[PDB]
Write a protein that binds this ligand. Structure first.
Ligand SMILES: *C1=CC(=O)N(CC)C1=O
Ligand SMILES: *C1=CC(=O)N(CC)C1=O
Ligand SMILES: [Ba+2]
Ligand SMILES: [Ba+2]
Ligand SMILES: [Ba+2]
Ligand SMILES: [Ba+2]
Ligand SMILES: [Ba+2]
Ligand SMILES: [Ba+2]
Ligand SMILES: [Ba+2]
Ligand SMILES: [Ba+2]
Ligand SMILES: [Ba+2]
Ligand SMILES: [Ba+2]
Ligand SMILES: [Ba+2]
Ligand SMILES: [Ba+2]
Ligand SMILES: [Ba+2]
Lengths: 254, 77
């Protein structure tokens, strides 16, 4: 028995809308203490992992772990029918092959119920917390957005380079070339504008701008961004959310 | 309330008498001046860990007679 009940269907719509940018399929790992929205893009390059914690809901029951694979197009179709100030509850039993979406309107008025068929998402999700990375930095989301949006205009590739006390994004191209150098920087009057860097190894990794463009959309949900890089694993982009947590995993370019 | 610290590198030991609530900046400045050196060029270590200038003896639980190692700061990295 799973009963995930959001106060407003707009909160769930916002999540479904977000994923709809990167991915087309999503796999909802529902557990006792929340839901983990796992997703792989169509090129299998970018991996999305979203932690929706118990506190995100108005009521949450999960007596047993269930996995709910859903088509994001179909799911959007149902989402249109209910009102934004409607209470949305996802209902599934143990071992589900179908799911129920219950929209409810207040006072004890109106209940709208729609069914959706789950799909089987077989491939195992490779969310890598990776026990150790070469470099870990954190910076304002807006700043990281600005950099990525500028340099993507110069190329489809953005290289990230970490040295002792230096982070450098670079994009060379055919019209021109550009690069931002940013440094560790702390301010007490405005702590939310700090840049943190930790290094154990220099890193030099090239990334597809279109992917980084997808990632930066996480800033609309958070004001800092954690970036953990390493020459063996995909890069980890993390955002802290009220819901819980947002993680992108990106394969470097050859 | 006033612990007594001994600061030293390889060749020079000094005693400073600071209050448990005074930040350690005052003392690192004072040791670096008495060597005609700048505070950024020296790396102060207490019982392994590198002291931060803003930290106080209280924070680090410095008892009487504790030793602060001073080492040179390498430029890289
Ligand atoms: C792609 C952009 C984004 O914000 N998310 C999660 C909500 C994606 O999957
Ligand atoms: C939800 C509203 C609606 O009209 N439909 C049919 C496509 C739904 O699934
Ligand atoms: Ba897209
Ligand atoms: Ba709440
Ligand atoms: Ba609640
Ligand atoms: Ba509507
Ligand atoms: Ba409501
Ligand atoms: Ba069943
Ligand atoms: Ba190039
Ligand atoms: Ba939080
Ligand atoms: Ba320095
Ligand atoms: Ba002690
Ligand atoms: Ba003690
Ligand atoms: Ba001691
Ligand atoms: Ba230095």
């Amino acid at each position: 028995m799973l009963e995930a009940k959001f106060e407003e269907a707009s909160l769930f719509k916002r999540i479904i809308d977000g994923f709809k940018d990167c991915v087309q399929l999503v796999n909802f790992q529902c557990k006792e203490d929340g839901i983990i929205a796992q997703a792989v893009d169509d090129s299998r390059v970018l991996l999305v992992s979203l932690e929706i914690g118990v506190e995100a809901f108005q009521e949450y029951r999960c007596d047993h772990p269930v996995t709910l694979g859903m088509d994001l197009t179909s799911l959007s179709k149902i989402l249109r029918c209910g009102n934004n100030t409607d209470t949305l509850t996802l209902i599934a039993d143990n071992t589900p092959d179908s799911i129920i979406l219950l929209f409810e309107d207040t006072k004890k008025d109106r209940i709208a119920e729609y069914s959706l068929k789950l799909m089987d998402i077989d491939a195992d999700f490779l969310g890598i917390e990776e026990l150790q990375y070469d470099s870990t930095l954190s910076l304002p989301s807006s700043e990281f957005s600005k950099i990525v949006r500028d340099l993507s205009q110069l190329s489809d590739s953005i290289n990230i380079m970490i040295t002792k006390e230096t982070i450098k994004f670079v994009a060379d191209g055919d019209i021109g070339s550009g690069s931002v150098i940013i440094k560790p920087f702390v301010d007490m009057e405005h702590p939310e504008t700090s840049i943190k860097l930790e290094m154990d190894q220099p890193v030099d990794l090239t990334f597809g701008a279109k992917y980084l463009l997808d990632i930066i959309k996480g800033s609309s949900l958070s004001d800092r961004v954690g970036i953990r890089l390493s020459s063996e694993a995909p890069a980890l982009f993390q955002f802290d959310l009220k819901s819980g947590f947002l993680q992108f995993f990106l394969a470097p370019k050859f | 309330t006033h612990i007594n610290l001994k600061v030293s590198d390889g060749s020079s030991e000094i005693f400073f008498k600071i209050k448990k609530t005074t930040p350690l900046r005052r003392l690192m400045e004072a040791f670096a001046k008495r060597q005609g050196k700048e505070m950024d060029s020296l790396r102060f270590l207490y019982d392994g860990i590198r002291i931060q200038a803003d930290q106080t003896p209280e924070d680090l639980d410095m008892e009487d007679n504790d030793i602060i190692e001073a080492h040179r700061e390498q430029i890289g990295g």
